[PDB]
A paper describes a structure:
Conjugative type IV secretion systems (T4SS) mediate bacterial conjugation, a process that enables the unidirectional exchange of genetic materials between a donor and a recipient bacterial cell. Bacterial conjugation is the primary means by which antibiotic resistance genes spread among bacterial populations. The recent cryo-electron microscopy (cryo-EM) structure of the conjugative Type 4 Secretion System (T4SS) encoded by the plasmid [name] revealed that the remaining VirB proteins form a large assembly organised into four sub-complexes: the outer membrane core complex (OMCC), the stalk, the arches and the inner membrane complex ([name]). Previously, we solved the cryo-electron microscopy (cryo-EM) structure of a conjugative T4SS. In this article, based on additional data, we present a more complete T4SS cryo-EM structure than that published earlier.
From our previous work, the [name] is a hexamer of an [name] protomer which we defined as including two [name]/[name] subunits ([name]/VirB4central and [name]/VirB4outside), one [name]/[name] subunit and three [name]/VirB8tails. We now define an “extended [name] protomer” containing not only the same set of proteins but also three additional polypeptides: the fourth [name]/VirB8tail mentioned above, the TM region (α1 and α2) of [name]/[name] (residues 30–82), and a newly discovered density, corresponding to [name]/[name] (residues 21 to 69) (in green in Fig. 5A). In this region of the [name], side chains are clearly visible and a complete model of the 4th [name]/VirB8tail was built. In these regions of [name], the density was of sufficiently high resolution to build side chains. The interaction between [name]/VirB10IM with [name]/[name] α1 and α2 are particularly interesting because this binding site for [name] on [name] entirely overlaps with that of VirB2, the pilus subunit. As can be seen, the VirB10IM-binding site on [name] encompasses entirely the VirB2-binding site, and therefore, VirB10IM in this conformation would prevent VirB2 subunits from being recruited to the [name] assembly platform. Therefore, we propose that the regulation of pilus biogenesis is controlled at least in part by the interaction between VirB10IM and the TM region of [name]. The structure of the T4SS we have solved, therefore, represents an early, inhibited, assembly state preceding pilus biogenesis. We, therefore, further hypothesise that contacts between donor and recipient cells may be required to release VirB10IM from [name], thereby freeing the VirB2 recruitment site and allowing pilus biogenesis to proceed.
Numbering used by the authors:
A (entry chain A): 1 to 531, 607 to 822
B (entry chain J): 30 to 82
C (entry chain F), F (entry chain G): 22 to 62
D (entry chain H): 21 to 69
E (entry chain C): 1 to 104
G (entry chain B): 15 to 130, 147 to 235, 240 to 432, 441 to 498, 607 to 764, 775 to 821
H (entry chain D): 5 to 62
I (entry chain E): 13 to 62
The structure:
């Protein structure tokens, strides 16, 4: 009745464990299954697709298929998973500078109405011990002694571990990362289980390693599927999520590379899926013989009929592709049932645009939704055999460059930049393994901006150095033509405007007397011979503009400044920056000291942020070569004049990307970031726009910060005047500096 | 001939099932086929009966 | 009141069950006797 | 004694309905009318024989 | 935009896809289901009832030729969304996350 | 006290007499029952 | 109606409630030991001793529920003084609390003993077994400070303390109930919950509540794992049960589990060997297993607020390696499973080792004292604490309870400010205060509180008096005479009136030969006569220099420890019965930290009395403390203006402001 | 739902309470015993009636 | 001892009052079935006359 019915309804349910085929981690990278089918998950940073010639994606598919066809055992399987998702993990940053706070509030205001979503690719290469279903029909019933169960155990683990090594070696340019157990707080947290749980739950719940089968406790969201429909509903604590599945069932006379790219640019957060149950050469040859027989039992079409299947069968025997059973189920996530249907219709239009006729899954919604979890063939709706080249053409592991929002060595990403593609890039200095000589290290964090100036180079570097204060980083800025003075003053640090005819202001007279300091001072006076507190602030600046014409003085000035900054780096977040680097660095003395102290500094959170106006002038010298090759995060800028030799030979930039750089406008703000192998023609932009607040389109303009950040000796020579009249504090004199700016802006 | 109710029930059930395809969304021959095949089979059965008499 | 009430109500329910079964058995035994002594002649 | 306010009740999915192509009903009815008159005449001969 | 497109160099895809193993043009598993059903009818009511084979067999051939894998979808639906008991109570078919296997 | 003692007295007297009459009437029912209902059988 | 789930029937002895199915029960009120005072070294020893005393009385009959109930305490009442200065102090100090937590934790352990002219002797055997179990548990919990809940007569209407906890479990609000002739199941519920038939949330008669089931098997990392919940912005009742299994039953369960794990298609040697280790760890490790379900029932006002509470709790427990599984249809069973002796309604219990039960509920709580119910009205004041829990300070901590208090710390470092604050806010009791002073510490404070502080004659005229002997402190001729005279005259006044002493420094009068014996005898006489000594000392080495001082220190109730970096190791360590870890915490405070470690009974916390903005506390401490220039200004004003307390205080404010400029 | 119990006799209240609990349990088990005894007697007369009814069915 | 984890768990999961209510209810149900069976037999006999 009204009391006991709770238990009566409780015990009469089918738990989600019946549908989730997982169990104990057996190896730190491999998950078991109740049917003993061990699998591993492969997080992939898909390589860029926009910046490549059309033939070169063909070449990528060729290499990828060539590596696959070596290891594609008849016992394999693949589940790609491109889980488009929106970024909830990007914390708002505290700040102290008023100018920085204003800049960041304006910038984050400029993102009202933008796709803030990041692609996340995956791959789970699975390994069934036995291929043929007929004998496995018996094998599901027999009893095996534990020792032979162990024998199957090591056989499968070794086989899958070889597969993992081969895939890792084959994804060198794809930035792949095998996911494996990581420990938090004296307990084991699984890295793959979080992904497969995201497949089940729709959220990212950190899954610990408890003392049960994972099938028992891996679902924390009660799903609900409609009786007659295509959409469902996940009843969770944080809120309902309605999902509407979809299905592909009609191919065409084509496997054009990356035809499913259009769903990368989506406005709807979804989860694509695939499957490639690799299939035996006799069975594949029989399927192709069946197609041949059916076709040849008809009128003699001239060419589609005969020679095509001639070459198809001849390749299949000659080992150039491996057929397999495949199924793709795009599932869109949404908040209301109308909206998920709207997204489903959009996805159907997108798929029809690339000639793969989709039909929404209606009767097998639940079967499809349980067909996403890897190691589930019994739940796939429509497995249809295809060529392997074709499967790798339904999942070339293309991806827009996005970067890593969190998890970085310093923390959150420094800035977020508009991309011409549309998908936002989460910029950050620390790239992944450029040097590629040793795994255990601190992530290389350099940066090299190159390109003819006035195209925003000073604007760009000021923008990064203005937004990077969420880290509280020390900065030492060697600039040129007084451009950075206004910014460095705005960031509340000492800026020394070195100039001829005025006393230098700093000298080594009061240096400490220790024997190492005596060594340095002896070295300096041996180098000079030729023919207040520095610990006060955080963001320093020094101007070396007049030293470009000085052969002798560059060595003493840079020697002293660099030595003083050397004592600074004791583990605190330190960010050297520069400008037109080679001439300050065009010194015979400290190239060796620079490389050695570079290797030293890189450990305790050191960064070099280089710059350049004429990259042709830099690559010539010896010193600039090691520094070009020692920068992870390139940032190229545009130039009306370009040369093939410098950009390709020196900067490891491909031919298509070089033509892309040449194609850039003269003064259009567009700079090609190149963190690692991945590329993306991003553009931070400071144009006019509208704000959605109180129903008011409050016109907001970044020029009030452009005339601050942008380099102008003229503006600086009146900024210096107004600071001389009132030099109280940058937080205080900023409004009146803007006032005098408004006073001259019409004279 | 009891085969007369027999053909009645079989042909009517077959017609109902075949027209259930339009709801089931497994047939893309809505107008031309559902008149043409139905009229062909109907004329065949009518000829069969008018011959049997 | 309370637990003692439950005890008292319980044994009186048992007592009236005893009265019911004794009445049914007495009537049904007298019925058996009467059908028998209806047969005997 | 009433459903508790602001909670997740039954699904909003039961509201779904299967749409009807707005020609199936009318022509299906007329088709059954004609097939039925044929079948009734047929059983008229069935009993008459 | 226009991500990589085709210029007739696309890798050939042959239409041996979902050309299921078929006898008379009908897959083995569903045709065996029909054989079992008609055999049941023949053994149950009357023996004249292997004439029930050709009608439904032809309708199954027409179903399979149009949409090659209807029967797999049918069986998946029947097994999962048709078995789930409490469809009415929840307003939708749902499976409890916590594993209540009737134990204590 | 008085009420509990009265309830216990009713317990003893009435319930014990109810089952005593149950036993005696059941035994008389059994005697007559066997007798007549075997008689006409 | 609702009694279909509540098993309670009536009492069998003063301290053992019965059950409908004859399952005798007992309730204990466990204060718990502080997990901040002692380092990580002693927590393991605590768990081990609890394991020892549990397996000592291990039997298949026993069981244990454990509840951590959090309250938004309202029973702490506002009090109105009869002086404007104290009212000002109270009003600003209370306004210093807008936005704080104001939540207390209570920990309850219940022991239920269900058996599995003979009948009467078996009734006696059952009750005797349970009382012996209670005696052993009480011997065990001496450090924790638990008290045995038992009946308490209130004016001819006998009541029953254990019913109150079992009421709060179901009613959700402390509704007192009398013991009466019904079975308590009929009327123990007053505000009956109304669970939504789908079971996501609930109701009460005001507060919506959703649940979480914390099903964990892995051995805990910390001896208290999910103690992050002890500090949170939501109320709950976290419940654990330990229905023991007889030793053969535990062996059989482990054997069946190992067999069913073996007979599978995948081999996991990280599990089978561990379980097989535990199976003969059970025999030799001597811990007895049992059933265990864990449920957290957060309360709220808005249903969305309850879901936000659940999400916060789920995150804050994933931070400690446990995964909460939300409850959707089992909520009715879960809630009716909270009542002790409701074995039937547990959702899905699974056997847990004894170490892991005592390590999931180890009886840790931040020390918080008694909000009310004290022998002297409510708690005097509500001190803050590190980690944000309100300590409800009071001098009466466990034949009236002992009240003597000592305040050891430097006079410059906030001793006098603290004493003035405590006396001013404890003026709500209207007790007589007989103040003694060193270096004119409390002259201004007393004169503000309407005393007749006599800087250096019957007590009926005023309530407060203060005698200053800082002039006559170190002059061995007649301290003993003057102290006998003051003590004798004050003692003559000691009858009926709620009474108090304050000694700023006592070790000089302590070395008196004649006076010390009189003090000890009068102490023995007064302990039942509402006597509250408030001792103090500038530095403990001054006190422990005298031997009799140790004897007087042994008879003290609450110790407050200011920040004294120059603290001798021996004094705090063995002289004052402090812990080594507490000695570390004393030194951890800076020179002028303004925090202090209050060892109250056998638990302690850092009562950080912070005078932040929101400041009027600056003005109050400016008038609270006493300096010779302050004293001379006060004396001049009092001489010229008159006697009344509040007439001169604005003039004093003006003159002191002029001095500060 | 009456007022509190008489506090003058704590011992008497729960003394009679334990007495009542034991007596209730004893009377309920005795009632179960008589229940199966009556079930057996009812079965015995039921089969006597059935046997004579069949044998007298000519 | 009991030596059965199922036995101990089900012992905890069981209450005396409900078990005995069910026991006496089943005993009375069986007694009623036997009584009705006896009435059926007597009806059969009284028919068996004629």
């Amino acid at each position: 009745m009204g009391a006991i019915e709770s238990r009566k309804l409780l015990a009469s349910e089918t738990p989600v464990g019946q549908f989730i085929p997982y169990s104990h981690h057996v190896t730190d990278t491999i998950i078991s299954t109740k049917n003993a089918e061990y699998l591993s998950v492969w997080k992939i940073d898909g390589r860029s697709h926009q910046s490549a010639s059309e033939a070169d994606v063909f070449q990528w598919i060729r290499e990828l298929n060539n590596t696959l066809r070596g290891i594609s055992s008849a016992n394999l399987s693949l589940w790609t998973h491109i889980v488009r998702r929106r970024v909830y993990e990007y914390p708002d940053a505290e700040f102290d500078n008023v100018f920085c706070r204003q800049l960041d509030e304006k910038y984050r205001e400029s993102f009202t109405g933008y796709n803030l979503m990041v692609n996340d690719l995956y791959l789970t290469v699975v390994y069934r011990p036995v291929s043929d279903k007929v004998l496995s029909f018996f094998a599901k019933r027999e009893r095996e002694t534990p020792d032979q169960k162990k024998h199957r155990q090591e056989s499968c683990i070794k086989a899958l571990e070889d597969i993992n090594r081969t895939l890792g070696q084959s994804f060198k340019r794809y930035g792949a990362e095998l996911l494996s157990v990581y420990e938090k707080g004296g307990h084991a947290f699984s890295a793959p289980l979080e992904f497969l749980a995201r497949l089940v739950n729709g959220e990212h719940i950190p899954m610990p390693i408890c003392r049960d089968r994972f099938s028992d406790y891996m679902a924390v969201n009660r799903p609900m599927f409609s009786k007659w429909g295509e959409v469902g509903e996940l009843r969770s604590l944080t809120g309902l999520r309605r999902f509407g599945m979809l299905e592909i069932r009609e191919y065409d006379d084509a496997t054009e590379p990356g035809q499913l790219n259009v769903l990368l640019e989506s406005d709807y957060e979804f989860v694509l899926t695939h499957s490639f149950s690799v299939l035996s050469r006799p069975a594949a040859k029989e399927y192709l013989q069946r197609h041949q027989k059916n076709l040849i039992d008809a009128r003699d079409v001239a060419t589609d009929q005969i020679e095509e299947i001639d070459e198809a069968l001849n390749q299949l025997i000659s080992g150039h592709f491996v057929m397999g059973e495949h199924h793709c189920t795009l599932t869109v996530y949404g908040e209301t049932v109308q909206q998920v249907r709207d997204n489903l219709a959009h996805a159907s239009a997108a798929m029809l645009d690339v000639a793969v006729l989709p039909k929404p899954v209606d009767l097998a919604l639940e079967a499809g939704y349980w067909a996403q979890l890897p190691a589930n063939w019994q739940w796939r709706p429509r497995p249809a055999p295809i060529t392997s080249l074709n499967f790798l053409s339904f999942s070339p592991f293309h991806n827009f460059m996005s970067g890593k929002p969190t998890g970085n060595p310093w923390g959150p990403a420094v800035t977020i930049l508009k991309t011409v593609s549309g998908t936002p890039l989460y910029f950050n200095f620390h790239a992944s393994k450029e040097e590629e000589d040793a795994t255990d290290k601190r992530l290389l964090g350099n940066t090299m901006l190159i390109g003819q100036s006035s195209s925003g180079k000073t604007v760009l570097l000021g923008f990064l150095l203005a937004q990077a204060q969420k880290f509280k980083p020390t900065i030492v800025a060697f600039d040129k033509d007084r451009g950075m003075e206004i910014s460095i003053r705005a960031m509340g640090g000492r800026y020394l405007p070195l100039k001829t005819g005025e006393p230098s202001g700093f000298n080594p007279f009061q240096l400490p007397p220790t024997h190492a300091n005596l060594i340095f001072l002896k070295q300096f006076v041996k180098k000079l011979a030729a023919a207040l507190d520095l610990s006060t602030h955080q963001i320093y600046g020094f101007d070396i503009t007049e030293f470009l014409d000085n052969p002798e003085a560059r060595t003493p000035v840079m020697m002293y400044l660099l030595y003083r900054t050397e004592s600074m780096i004791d583990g605190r977040r330190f960010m050297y920056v520069f400008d037109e680097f080679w001439k300050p660095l065009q010194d015979e003395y400290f190239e060796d000291l620079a490389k050695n102290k570079q290797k030293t500094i890189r450990k305790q959170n050191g960064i070099f942020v280089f710059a350049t106006q004429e990259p042709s002038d830099a690559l010539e010298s010896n010193i600039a070569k090691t520094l070009i090759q020692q920068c992870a995060t390139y940032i190229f800028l545009a130039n009306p004049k370009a040369d093939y030799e410098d950009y390709t030979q020196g900067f490891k930039l491909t031919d298509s990307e070089f033509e892309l750089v040449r194609g850039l406008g003269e003064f259009s703000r567009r700079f090609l970031i190149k963190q690692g192998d991945q590329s993306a023609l991003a553009e931070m932009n400071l144009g006019k726009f509208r704000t959605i607040v109180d129903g008011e389109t409050v016109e907001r303009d970044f020029d009030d910060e452009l005339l601050v950040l942008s380099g102008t000796p003229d503006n600086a020579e009146i900024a210096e005047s107004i600071i001389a009249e009132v030099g109280d504090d940058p937080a205080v004199w900023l409004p009146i500096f803007l006032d005098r700016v408004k006073a001259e802006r019409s004279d | 001939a009891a085969i007369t109710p027999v053909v009645s029930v079989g042909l009517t059930l077959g017609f109902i099932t075949y027209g259930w395809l339009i709801i089931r969304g497994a047939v893309e021959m809505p107008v031309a086929e559902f008149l043409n095949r139905c009229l062909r089979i109907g004329i065949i059965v009518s000829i069969a009966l008018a011959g049997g008499l | 009141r309370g637990l003692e009430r439950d005890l008292i109500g319980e044994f009186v329910k048992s007592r009236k069950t005893a009265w019911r079964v004794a009445t049914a058995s007495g009537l049904f035994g007298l019925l058996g006797m009467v059908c028998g002594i209806v047969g005997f002649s | 004694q009433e459903r508790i306010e602001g909670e997740y009740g039954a699904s909003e999915l039961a509201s779904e309905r299967r749409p009807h192509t707005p020609g199936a009903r009318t022509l299906l009815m007329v088709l059954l009318c004609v097939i039925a008159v044929v079948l009734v005449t047929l059983s008229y001969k069935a009993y008459k024989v | 935009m226009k991500p990589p497109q085709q210029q007739h160099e696309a890798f050939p895809l042959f239409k041996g896809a979902t050309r299921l193993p078929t006898i008379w043009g009908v897959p083995m598993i569903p045709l065996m289901a029909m054989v079992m059903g008609v055999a049941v009818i023949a053994l149950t009511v009357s023996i004249w009832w292997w004439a029930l084979v050709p009608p439904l067999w032809f309708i199954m051939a027409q179903i399979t030729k149009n949409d090659d894998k209807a029967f797999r979808i049918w069986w998946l639906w029947i097994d999962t969304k048709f078995r789930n008991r409490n469809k009415g109570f929840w307003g939708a078919s749902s499976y409890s996350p916590a594993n209540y296997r009737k134990r204590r």
